[PDB]
Amino acid sequence: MQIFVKTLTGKTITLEVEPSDTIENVKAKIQDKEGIPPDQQRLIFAGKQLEDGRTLSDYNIQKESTLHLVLRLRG
Amino acid sequence: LPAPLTNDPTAIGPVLPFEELHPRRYPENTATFLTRLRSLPSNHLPQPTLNCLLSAVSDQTKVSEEHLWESLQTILPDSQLSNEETNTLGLSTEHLTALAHLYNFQATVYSDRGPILFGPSDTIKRIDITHTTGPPSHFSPGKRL
Numbered sequence: 001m002q003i004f005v006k007t008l009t010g011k012t013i014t015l016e017v018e019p020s021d022t023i024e025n026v027k028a029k030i031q032d033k034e035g036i037p038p039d040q041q042r043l044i045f046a047g048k049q050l051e052d053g054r055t056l057s058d059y060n061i062q063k064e065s066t067l068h069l070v071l072r073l074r075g
Numbered sequence: 076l077p078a079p080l081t082n083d084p085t086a087i088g089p090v091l092p093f094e095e096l097h098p099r100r101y102p103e104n105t106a107t108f109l110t111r112l113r114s115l116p117s118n119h120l121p122q123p124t125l126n127c128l129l130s131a132v133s134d135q136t137k138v139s140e141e142h143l144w145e146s147l148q149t150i151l152p153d154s155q156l157s158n159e160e161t162n163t164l165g166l167s168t169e170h171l172t173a174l175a176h177l178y179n180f181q182a183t184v185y186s187d188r189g190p191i192l193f194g195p196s197d198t199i200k201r202i203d204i205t206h207t208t209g210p211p212s213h214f215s216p217g218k219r220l
């Protein structure tokens with residue numbers, strides 16, 4: 001399948017992942033596409049901040065379903 | 076996977092997002108970080124050693140770091156204000172969103188990846204923060220080019 005990710009800078013990335021793909025590997029692919037480490041990544045699917053230790057199928061995310069990305073900048 | 080704020084003694088209620096507990100006109104999804112409603116009064120926590128964010132906010136809002144830290148103690152549980160992350164990596168932008176809600180402003184963070192907004196849009200004050208990837212993230216006032 002294929003989904004989309006809307007970032008905090010307005011850019012909507014197009015990503016290709018498996019239905020059983022873990023959120024950690026999704027953040028790794030986002031790091032590949034952009035360069036944002038998983039340290040500053042928090043993914044949201046309709047208001048609910050996703051957990052790293054889960055998969056896309058658990059949140060019932062179909063193909064072409066957009067996920068929001070929020071940066072958790074430390075410092 | 077386990078969370079310290081789940082059984083935090085300085086907070087009451089269950090785990091809810093910050094936007095549900097204190098709703099405003101935050102930037103889209105920038106307030107979805109989970110927290111809990113503060114129960115006990117200010118424990119008088121010490122000023123965090125990694126206090127770059129507090130200095131950056133103080134240079135813009137003219138509010139002393141002490142008052143900002145006390146307001147953070149009144150809004151947030153202790154387990155999310157001074158923990159292993161606070162003393163190693165430092166403060167997060169979630170504290171910046173909490174301070175923006177408490178003091179009514181929309182901070183503009185000029186990070187290495189571009190400009191981001193944090194805090195309610197239904198405000199007047201607009202502060203500017205410069206974010207450095209470093210390592211690690213360094214917080215300063217103003218913007219850069």
Ligand SMILES: *NC[C@H](*)CC(=O)OC
Binds near residue numbers: 124214
């Ligand atoms: N991230 C904590 C603040 C950084 C700092 O204090 O640098 C001087």
